[PDB]
Design a protein around this ligand. Structure first.
Ligand SMILES: O=C(O)C1=C[C@@H](O)[C@@H](O)[C@H](O)C1
Ligand SMILES: O=C(O)C1=C[C@@H](O)[C@@H](O)[C@H](O)C1
Lengths: 9, 209, 210
C-alpha cells in the first residue's frame, strides 16, 4: 500500500 | 540456480529484515545453491560501494542527487524518542519532538542515511537540538541512552525492549522513514542478483509496506 | 579536564561496555566537561583510523605486527557456538568445536579482529569449516542463525537470548578472547584522553578481566 507513497521525493 | 550475491545494508536490517528475505528467497528449490556475502554499514559508506561495484545490491536510505542509483521502496520504520527510565520524559508514552528541546541528544553521525529525515523534523519545528555526542550504529546509541548519557531519536527496533529505557512515540511532527532497495542504473546485473532483487521487491510490497 | 575524546570501538562494545565506562568516568566532577564522539567498526578498519588520528583511543582486537600501536588488556569475551533453536546441535548444552564439522557457518569476514583466534581454533583441531556466507557485524550474524541459514561461532552477548537460537558453550578447544585499549605508541595524548585511558584500564582490571 505504501509503495507508491515511498516513490515520492 | 548457481551464483553469488554481494549485498550491503544498513545496520538495523541485519537483525530481522535481511534474514527474513534470505530465508524466504532460499526456500525455493532453484535458489538453494545461490550464495551471499553480507556487508553492514551506514548509507553514506554504502553508496560508494555500490558505485565501485563491491555490492551487487544495497538496502539503505534514499540519498538526494544520486541519479546513477535507483532507489525502490522496500520497507519502513517508525522513528521514536528513547530515554533512560529515570529521565523526566519517561513518565510519558508519546511526545512532540519540541518537548525534547531541553535535553542532550545522542545524535546520529553525518554518515547516517537517517540524518536528512531527522534534521528536517527539527527544522520543521524550528528547534536546534542540544547534541551531546555522536554515534553511528544503533546498539551503541541505545547503550548510551540506557546509562542516561543522553536521549535519542532513532528507529523503533526490537532490541530497545531489552534496555532500561522508555520508548516514546512521536506525535508531531509527522514522519515517514522509508528504506530502499538500491542498485546502479543502466548496469549489468547477474541472474542471481536480478532474481533476488525482483524477489525482495515483491516480498516488501506484500509483507513490509 | 576538558576537551574532546574520539573513541573508536568494535561493535560489541556499544551495548554495555562503553556505556559503563563513560557513565562511571563522567561521575567525576573534573570529567563532567569532557566530550566524546563514538565510532563503531571492525578491528581492521579501526587500526588505520588510530594511525591517521581520527580516533584518540580505540577498543579492539589485538593485531600482530603493529609496532606503532600499544595494546593493553581491557576486557574479555567468551566464544560460543550459536545454532537455530531446532538445529540438530540444539539437543546439547555444550559441544566440542569439532562437533560442528558437518554444518554450514555464517562466518566472520576477514575485516574481523576475531578471525585470528577463530581460525586458530579450527586449525588446532585440524578442521576446515564449511562456510556458507560471511558477515561483519554481530546482530546480522545471529539474525541469520535465527532463520537457520547457518550456525556460527561468536562472542556471547546479551542479545543472543532474544533470538530463536540455542547458545552452546565450547568445551574444546578453550582459548581466551581478549579485547584491548589501543593507542598510538609514544604519541602526545591529551589530558582528557589520558585521564580516560588510565580510568578505563584500571576499571577493566578491577571489573572486566577477572
Ligand atoms: O540509514 C542509515 O544509513 C542508518 C540508520 C541508522 O538507524 C543507523 O543504523 C546508522 O546510522 C545507518
Ligand atoms: O574484534 C573485531 O574486530 C570484531 C569482533 C566481532 O565480534 C564483530 O563485532 C566484528 O567482526 C568486529
Amino acid at each position: 500500500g505504501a509503495y507508491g507513497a515511498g516513490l515520492a521525493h | 540456480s548457481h551464483g553469488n550475491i554481494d549485498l550491503g545494508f544498513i545496520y538495523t536490517m541485519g537483525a530481522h529484515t535481511v534474514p527474513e528475505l534470505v530465508q524466504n528467497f532460499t526456500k525455493v528449490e532453484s535458489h538453494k545453491d545461490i550464495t551471499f556475502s553480507f556487508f553492514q554499514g551506514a548509507t553514506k559508506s554504502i553508496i560508494p560501494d555500490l558505485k565501485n561495484e563491491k555490492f551487487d545490491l544495497a538496502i539503505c536510505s534514499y540519498v538526494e542527487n544520486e541519479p546513477d542509483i535507483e532507489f525502490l521502496p522496500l520497507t519502513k520504520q517508525e522513528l521514536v524518542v528513547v530515554v533512560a527510565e529515570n529521565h523526566p520524559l519517561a513518565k510519558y508514552d508519546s511526545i512532540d519532538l519540541q518537548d525534547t528541546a531541553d535535553y542532550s541528544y545522542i545524535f546520529f553521525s553525518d554518515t547516517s542515511g537517517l540524518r536528512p529525515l531527522i534534521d528536517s523534523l527539527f527544522a520543521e519545528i524550528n528547534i536546534q537540538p542540544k547534541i551531546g555526542c555522536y554515534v553511528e550504529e544503533d546498539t551503541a546509541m541505545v547503550g548510551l541512552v540506557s546509562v542516561d548519557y543522553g536521549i535519542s531519536i532513532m528507529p523503533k527496533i526490537s532490541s530497545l525492549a531489552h534496555y532500561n529505557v522508555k520508548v516514546l512515540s512521536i506525535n508531531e511532527p509527522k514522519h515517514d522513514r522509508f528504506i530502499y532497495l538500491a542498485s546502479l542504473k543502466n548496469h549489468y546485473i547477474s541472474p542471481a542478483s536480478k532474481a533476488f532483487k525482483d524477489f525482495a521487491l515483491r516480498y516488501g510490497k506484500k509483507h513490509f509496506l
